[PDB]
Amino acid sequence: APVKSQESINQKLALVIKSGKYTLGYKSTVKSLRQGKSKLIIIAANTPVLRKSELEYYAMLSKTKVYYFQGGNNELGTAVGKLFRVGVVSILEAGDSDILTTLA
């Protein structure tokens, strides 16, 4: 999270989710990252050190990037699912906008 860009990652990631391949929620990401073919993970959820370290480990095993958006509330829920607050996300094919090569 670059200081002002809490809207930009939201907008660009929803703009991607319009047709690109994503996953939502801890088990969903963990599964999908253990499936290797991920490229970018987002953590916008109250995620402690061991929990982030596990996601970060799968983002290291898979040849992936980690993006912390850990506002301690729900700020990416806006882009992804609107209802749940746990903004833990990952993207596998951004076949829409360049997010995994610019938000890199």
The CATH number that applies at residue 4 is 3.30.1330.30
Experimental approach was: NMR
- Pairwise CA distance, residues 87 & 72, whole Å: 10
- Pairwise CA distance, residues 63 & 49, whole Å: 21
Amino acid at 58: Y
Q: CA torsion 69→85→45→71, rounded to 10°? A: 40
> Which residues lie closer than 8 Å to 61 by C-beta, 6 or more apart?
33, 34, 36
Q: Which alpha helices (DSSP H) does the chain contain, by range?
A: 8-17, 26-34, 49-61, 99-102
The boundaries of the domain holding residue 86 are 1-104
Q: Is-contact 12 40, C-beta < 8 A?
A: no
Number of domains in the chain: 1
- Pairwise CA distance, residues 40 & 66, whole Å: 6
Q: Is-contact 43 55, C-beta < 8 A?
A: yes
Number of alpha helices (DSSP H) and beta strands (DSSP E) in the chain: 4, 4
Q: Is 22 helix (H, G, I), strand (E, B) or coil?
A: strand
